[PDB]
Design a protein around this ligand. Structure first.
Ligand SMILES: [K+]
Ligand SMILES: [K+]
Lengths: 80, 75, 99, 98, 80
DNA sequence: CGTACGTGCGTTTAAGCGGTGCTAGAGCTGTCTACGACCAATTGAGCGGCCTCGGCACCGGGATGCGTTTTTTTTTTCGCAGCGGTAC
DNA sequence: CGCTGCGAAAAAAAAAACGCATCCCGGTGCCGAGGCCGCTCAATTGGTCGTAGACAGCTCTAGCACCGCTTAAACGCACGTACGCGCTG
């Protein structure tokens, strides 16, 4: 469907909050959904390449880790 | 140490500063404290006192709205 | 009158709340549905280790939050308190994420 | 008495230097500065002429790029002059300081 | 023992000019010199370390490169 | 509205240049040593099942402090009529 | 009359009352840490081979001083203008 809109206005708020933002423009929610999209896009691609090269049909925690590490964005706690 | 009415407080600063744009709210604020006496609210009382001149027709307003912009004397 | 807090007070309580906690701030399923969507653009009928979805949610939120942080500083830099697209935009331009 | 208004020679100088590629720092001052800074880490060290210029390339590249990032931070705050606080913002966002 | 001051106001201006800056606070030149210091310091540290590990009393262009690369500040045309 | 840059013309400097002279130090060659790869065999360190019990999240129920309103007061700040002393 | 005193009147400001959210207390109850059981495969031993790297020097580069001529920058100061900065509505 169109699941990007499942990233609720309240959700993006909660995230701005943990980031230490007091006040939020209306325009932000769609810019945010905007950027999140490009993040998950660039990351999932490189993940699935790692899935594909491994000749699997199931994306493993490592695929995403290998991906995040690649993209500049290393993650601790899912292995590797 | 006398701080008269807002219908005759710092008329001397306004009239002792002949300008074509007239006197502003800053320039006038910078005279009450350079010769006369005043409190801390002074400025917020000057504003309510230039607003009672703006609506009635005691002191004209060159440009701007409210306190904002220059305000000259009756004549 | 009925009792009421003043614009920006609840926000600040909400900052303290969410900077104290670690729990993920996006709803699990909606995010999952988003992931599997953006996966269909690269291969169909894929599957995902439960753990691979979370590893992304932790990767996404962590990311956004740090952007908001760099954003909120570009708002504050323009004598504001309100984050606006042009603030994010400046972050990403300087971060070197866009041109 | 030909004089131009604060910012018109700037706009020219921008166009002159954006077009060329020569190094803008005088080279000796620069060379010395390196050795000054090398002392800190080891005494009586010697430098390949090319190693120096490689550092001058990197540095002049670094700064010019900062200035492009600084300059936007400035404009972001509805200004046209760059001020320490502009740089400070840039580097903080770039990830050069906390 | 203060060459930093060799990096002349008019030089820092030339760099800012190429960087598209039109107007420059005085408070800038120092802050700049400051940043340059950290940047040179940072790189040469890692440089000389390359030099020291190769038991050489001469720092080589390649030392400077391996360093710039380490710092993610990768440089072309000196032996990459 | 205030002021701190920008231009430009005038003094101060020292970078740049081209060439010369001395020498550390780069960087290669050959020799030979010590160190590490390879193999085999022998082990116990380290891993995937089990089975608790206790540290942790939780919950409801007062208790401390924190923000909101709005009530009472303290302190300042004009303005109107009601004084005590001048003046005559 | 002026002075003054008071009496507001005006904010200040305080205080205090209210009510709301954040903490913490103490007994549940649940699940995952933490600790045993065997057991298996990866680390150790010891010992053979052969070559990477330590050294002892041999070369000739290229990097560090010195040195005035020639400029183009730097320094610098003065004047003035455009910009940064702050207040209000
Ligand atoms: K050499
Ligand atoms: K050896």
């Amino acid at each position: 469907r169109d699941n990007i809109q499942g990233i609720t206005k309240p959700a993006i708020r909660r995230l701005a909050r943990r980031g230490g933002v007091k006040r939020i423009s209306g325009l932000i929610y769609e810019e945010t959904r905007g950027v999140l999209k490009v993040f998950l896009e660039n990351v999932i691609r490189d993940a699935v390449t790692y899935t594909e090269h491994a000749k699997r049909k199931t994306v493993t925690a490592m695929d995403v880790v290998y991906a995040l590490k690649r993209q500049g964005r290393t993650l601790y706690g899912f292995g590797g | 140490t006398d701080h008269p009415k807002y219908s005759d407080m710092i008329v001397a600063a306004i009239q002792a500063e002949k300008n074509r744009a007239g006197s502003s709210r800053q320039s006038i604020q910078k005279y009450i404290k350079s010769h006369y006496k005043v409190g801390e609210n002074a400025d917020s009382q000057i504003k309510l006192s230039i607003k009672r001149l703006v609506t009635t027709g005691v002191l004209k307003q060159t440009k701007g709205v409210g306190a904002s912009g220059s305000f000259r004397l009756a004549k | 009158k009925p009792h009421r807090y003043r614009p920006g007070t609840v926000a600040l309580r909400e900052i303290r709340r969410y900077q104290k906690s670690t729990e993920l701030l996006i709803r699990k399923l909606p995010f999952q549905r988003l992931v599997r969507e953006i996966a269909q653009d690269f291969k169909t009928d894929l599957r995902f280790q439960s753990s691979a979805v979370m590893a992304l949610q932790e990767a996404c939120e962590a990311y956004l939050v740090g952007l908001f942080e760099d954003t909120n500083l570009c708002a504050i830099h323009a004598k504001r308190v309100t984050i606006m697209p042009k603030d994010i935009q400046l972050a990403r331009r300087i971060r070197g994420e866009r041109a």
